Amino acid sequence: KSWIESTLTKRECVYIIPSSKDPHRCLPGCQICQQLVRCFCGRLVKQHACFTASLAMKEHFNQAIEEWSVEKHTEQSPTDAYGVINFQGGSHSYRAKYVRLSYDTKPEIILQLLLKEWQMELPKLVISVHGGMQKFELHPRIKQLLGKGLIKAAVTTGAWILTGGVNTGVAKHVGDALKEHASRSSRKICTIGIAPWGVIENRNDLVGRDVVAPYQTLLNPLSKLNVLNNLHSHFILVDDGTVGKYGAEVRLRRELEKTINQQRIHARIGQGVPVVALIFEGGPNVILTVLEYLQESPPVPVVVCEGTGRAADLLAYIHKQTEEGGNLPDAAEPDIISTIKKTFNFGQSEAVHLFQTMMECMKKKELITVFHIGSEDHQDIDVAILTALLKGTNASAFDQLILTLAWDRVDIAKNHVFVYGQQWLVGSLEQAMLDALVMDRVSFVKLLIENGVS
């Protein structure tokens, strides 16, 4: 009778079409074995709950009727997996909420899952951390900088950190940041992990309506699948019926970022909630993700952290050696590709196609912000995340002060908005103090009095 029980759905295979070889027909092929078939469902037979598991399961060799779809061969039914993921380990008991969500869930129902059911406050910033998905490592000089810098931007602003949530990617290094640093105001940080329901180790230990589910974080059963992270506060487990596959999380994460960007950041303030991307290691698929962010509808600025590994060093290596309009000086094109040959070993064709993807990223160089870790003076990633939202978007100078006014952060406004050259018009500074008085932003009233407001 609750809201989650009446609205959200789970998905399961009902129409077994195997991916295997028959001894003669329609059925086994290791031995008889009575188990070892492999549906496009992804599970096997005897896993399809009690019914839809029988003989005459779909020369022929399971072809021409294959046509597998999670749209045309899957059954919707209400969710049986919401509650609490009290983690057994790491003496501070970390409570975390979760739900099993369908991939076809409407993007506004997901928003009233977060803002109404889970009673989360509307964020003032959304940080989407992308990068590696293969348990990479970090230089400890880099890790103590990115840890201190990411968590500062989520406390000073009221921010949501969207990770993959699973402990075999960049969600671990966000989780290590939440451990090694401030746990006093970390109750105010919402770190949402949007993962598939086919990757998680102990899914069957998360089954049940509202409950405190005991859940491991260790003991590593050959690491064939992956496990949830301890230091995420909320999990959105995306189900598309299948088991052991990746991909259902991708559209539901991005359409969440669109609808939060559509929401209004404050009652007085008339702007959308800003969304920023963060790129730790990479992979060949992250270069497509960066290019996707730059070209949709007014774009998501990306923040690339060099030194952190594989593809983020490539986007920094291009950003260094190009023209402001994104033009290599016609003599470095083999010099670029041979670096891609070493990092991403595909060879001579797909590295060329990956170079054409990076050249499309360099047309919009005003939206990409590289962070040079410790060899810099423009340090403190906290600044570099927030200043990426001001430059590149081509907003008004009034609109940059007002965005920093909501964040209650004056160091961004005093050093970057109030710079020489900014042409303030008549009623912009006067209306900004009217917002600064009502919102009880005392340090902005001090800043605008020192800039010409009576």
Numbering used by the authors: 4 to 61, 69 to 464
List sentences quoted exactly from the publication behind this structure.
The NTD includes four melastatin homology regions (MHR1-4).
